[PDB]
Design an enzyme around this catalytic site. Structure first.
Site, PDB file in Angstrom:
ATOM      1  N   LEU D  37       4.416   3.601   3.463  1.00 43.22           N
ATOM      2  CA  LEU D  37       3.789   4.629   2.646  1.00 43.22           C
ATOM      3  C   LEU D  37       2.307   4.322   2.467  1.00 43.22           C
ATOM      4  CD1 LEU D  37       5.157   7.152   1.212  1.00 43.22           C
ATOM      5  CD2 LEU D  37       4.857   5.883  -0.913  1.00 43.22           C
ATOM      6  N   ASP D  38       1.494   5.373   2.512  1.00 40.62           N
ATOM      7  CA  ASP D  38       0.052   5.299   2.320  1.00 40.62           C
ATOM      8  C   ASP D  38      -0.323   5.909   0.972  1.00 40.62           C
ATOM      9  OD1 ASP D  38      -2.588   4.754   2.814  1.00 40.62           O
ATOM     10  OD2 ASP D  38      -2.736   5.949   4.648  1.00 40.62           O
ATOM     11  N   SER D  39      -1.607   5.782   0.615  1.00 44.93           N
ATOM     12  CA  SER D  39      -2.072   6.236  -0.694  1.00 44.93           C
ATOM     13  C   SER D  39      -1.857   7.735  -0.877  1.00 44.93           C
ATOM     14  CB  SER D  39      -3.550   5.885  -0.872  1.00 44.93           C
ATOM     15  OG  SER D  39      -3.776   4.502  -0.661  1.00 44.93           O
ATOM     16  N   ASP D  41       0.251   9.493   0.805  1.00 40.50           N
ATOM     17  CA  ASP D  41       1.697   9.624   0.731  1.00 40.50           C
ATOM     18  C   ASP D  41       2.219   9.167  -0.626  1.00 40.50           C
ATOM     19  OD1 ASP D  41       1.064  10.134   3.372  1.00 40.50           O
ATOM     20  OD2 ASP D  41       1.889   8.239   4.113  1.00 40.50           O
ATOM     21  N   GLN D  42       1.551   8.205  -1.267  1.00 38.55           N
ATOM     22  CA  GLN D  42       1.938   7.830  -2.624  1.00 38.55           C
ATOM     23  C   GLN D  42       1.732   8.989  -3.591  1.00 38.55           C
ATOM     24  OE1 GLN D  42       2.100   4.496  -0.686  1.00 38.55           O
ATOM     25  NE2 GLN D  42       0.265   3.846  -1.805  1.00 38.55           N
TER      26      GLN D  42
END
Lengths: 115, 111, 217, 79, 69
Positions: D37-39, D41-42
């Site tokens: 997960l990426d930012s 995506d966060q």
RNA sequence: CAGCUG
């Protein structure tokens, strides 16, 4: 007046008219029953030996008062079916393309400047 | 009245694969609203376009110039121009490669 | 005393009554939209209703290059470059679809007809559309700008080096040789400057028309 | 609603999302590398948390939670 | 890398908040579109392109130059 | 063939 064999200056994102060469495309034919062309007139244009249908949007001849008067005879590339080839026209197009009935709305879907 | 609401109701009951609208600010001279719609196949575009244009013709707006279905000959991309509205039917791949709403949003900010 | 040059009639033989009708009607159109004083060098923004559209305004900005025509149909044509295309629009002064025409920058260029901006570098026909209106001193002479432009390659849209045009706002000696001088100054015509009878004595008509414009109250 | 209520709702939402596979479903299911997960995506994930409980998570603490125990604690103490 | 990831967070928040009640358009289609916009082209570019994408996003939020009603 | 020319 964009007659037969006037050196056209295409304005489209499509690379068909952007392939550099000393042969700036020259109009082959005009579908007005007279051989003079005006705004929004289907013409046949030659680009690198390839025939195509094209739309006149802006020309150097002084037309009606409340439409623009461009520098060189701008055209838009349209495939044989009718789908416009390009997706971004850098130069602006007149509003006057919208008035009469005909196959002209689908090229209004690209103009960033309705000047 | 043949406003946008009834149109989107007809689209929803016909269940086009996608519907969306974009607004034209009054400082642009093109039209009032730009409805990007997408059905399933060319037959579906044909049928929904015919239904909406016939309903428009019969219901109201008799004292104005009639409405032409732009690009019915072309099987992928259709358009119709109303007095204030304009609607555009898109093939999936054609819609992707064109991406009109992007320009309508990024009029002078992206290629 | 400034009179808009589309109020002084072309010399001819049309009888006065038409001109009286024109003057009264165009004056009685001035009272719904003031047409500001503007010259053949000034910069203007025009705003015009779009009958093509559903009653929304359409704006434009550029340098006026010709003040042409007399009477209720006189027009002004303004040029401006955008995205590399030099678009000129000719606007009819008294049309029922010009809302306001405002002088963004009043300035009187050296010449009387700036038709050669079609053959100068785009830098002299570039104007950002959203520029802001420069103020002017009310009770003093208008600016006399002198930007003697630099020319594109030789094959101009006309032959401006000819002296019958009497253009003064182009750099010749910077990009012209004396050979052009001694070949283009056989067509110089001294006599025409001193022809004592081509001159239009447009003074008495000026006084009469000023009386008429005053009396519109 | 209830502590167990928010816990099970959070678990159900985490299961619902498609790009993350609920292999481990505890309150310590890390996000960045374990679940990929990426930012942005966060922010997408916490938006997915909002749509059934929450709805008022400001833009100050959207890139440090690091574990669903913090998700549960945030939902618990925000009310 | 960008001007700030916090600005990306805030503009994404505003876009999605106006997307929660997006009435005339389609929610699923807009979700796919915003994903394709702000994810593929906002990950691994130089700071110049980061700022270009940030400006694109802020405009897409603003709605002055075409609002997604 | 580049572009100018009633």
């Amino acid at each position: 007046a964009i007659q037969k064999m006037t050196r056209v200056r295409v304005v489209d994102n499509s690379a068909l008219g952007n392939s550099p060469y000393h042969r700036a495309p020259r109009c082959i034919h005009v579908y007005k029953k007279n051989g003079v062309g005006k705004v929004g007139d289907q013409i046949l244009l030659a680009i690198k030996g390839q025939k195509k249908k094209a739309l006149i949007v802006g020309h150097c001849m002084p037309g009606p008062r409340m439409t623009p008067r461009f520098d060189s005879n701008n055209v838009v590339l349209i495939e044989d079916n009718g789908n416009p080839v390009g997706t971004r026209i850098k130069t602006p197009i007149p509003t006057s393309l919208r008035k009469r009935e005909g196959e002209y709305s689908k090229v209004l879907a690209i103009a960033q400047n309705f000047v | 009245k043949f406003d946008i609401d009834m149109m989107v109701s007809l689209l929803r009951q016909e269940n086009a694969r996608d519907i969306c609208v974009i607004q034209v600010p009054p400082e642009m001279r093109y039209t009032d609203y730009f409805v990007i719609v997408s059905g399933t196949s060319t037959r579906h575009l044909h049928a929904m376009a015919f239904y909406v244009v016939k309903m428009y013709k019969h219901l109201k707006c008799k004292r104005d110039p009639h409405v032409k279905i732009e690009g019915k000959d072309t099987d992928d991309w259709l358009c119709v121009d109303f007095g204030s509205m304009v609607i555009h039917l898109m093939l999936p791949e054609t819609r992707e490669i064109y991406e009109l709403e992007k320009l309508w949003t990024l009029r002078s900010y992206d290629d | 005393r400034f009179l808009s040059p589309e109020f002084i009639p072309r010399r001819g033989r049309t009888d006065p009554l038409k001109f009286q009708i024109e003057r009264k009607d165009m004056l009685e159109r001035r009272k719904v939209l003031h047409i500001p004083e503007f010259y053949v060098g000034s910069i203007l923004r025009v705003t015009t209703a779009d009958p093509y559209a559903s009653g929304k305004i359409s704006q434009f900005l550029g340098i006026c290059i010709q003040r042409s025509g007399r009477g209720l149909g006189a027009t002004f044509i303004l040029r401006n470059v955008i995205e590399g295309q030099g678009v000129e629009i000719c606007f009819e002064l008294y049309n029922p679809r010009v809302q306001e025409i405002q002088v963004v920058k009043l300035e009187k260029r050296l010449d009387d007809s700036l038709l050669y901006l079609r053959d100068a570098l785009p830098e002299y026909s570039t104007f950002d559309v959203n520029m802001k209106p420069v103020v002017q001193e009310p009770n003093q002479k208008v600016p006399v700008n002198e930007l003697k432009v630099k020319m594109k390659p030789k094959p101009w849209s006309k032959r401006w080096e000819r002296p019958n045009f009497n253009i003064k706002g182009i750099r010749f000696d910077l990009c012209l040789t004396e050979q052009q001088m001694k070949e283009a100054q056989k067509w110089n015509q001294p006599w025409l400057e001193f022809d004592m009878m081509r001159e239009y004595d447009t003074s008495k008509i000026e006084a009469a028309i000023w009386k008429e414009i005053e009396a519109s109250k | 609603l209830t502590l167990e209520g928010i816990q099970d709702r959070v678990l159900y939402v985490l299961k619902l999302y498609d790009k993350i596979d609920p292999e481990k479903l505890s309150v310590n299911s890390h996000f960045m590398k374990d679940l990929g997960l990426d930012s942005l995506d966060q922010v997408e994930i916490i938006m997915a948390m909002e749509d059934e409980f929450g709805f008022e998570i400001p833009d100050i603490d959207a890139e440090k939670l690091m574990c669903p125990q913090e998700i549960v604690d945030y939902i618990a103490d925000k009310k | 890398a960008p001007w700030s990831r916090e600005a990306v967070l805030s503009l994404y928040r505003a876009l999605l908040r106006q997307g929660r009640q997006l009435r005339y358009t389609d929610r699923d289609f807009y979700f796919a579109s915003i994903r394709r916009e702000f994810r593929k082209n906002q990950k691994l570019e130089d700071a110049e392109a980061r700022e270009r994408q940030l400006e694109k996003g802020l405009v897409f939020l603003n709605g002055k130059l075409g609002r997604i009603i």
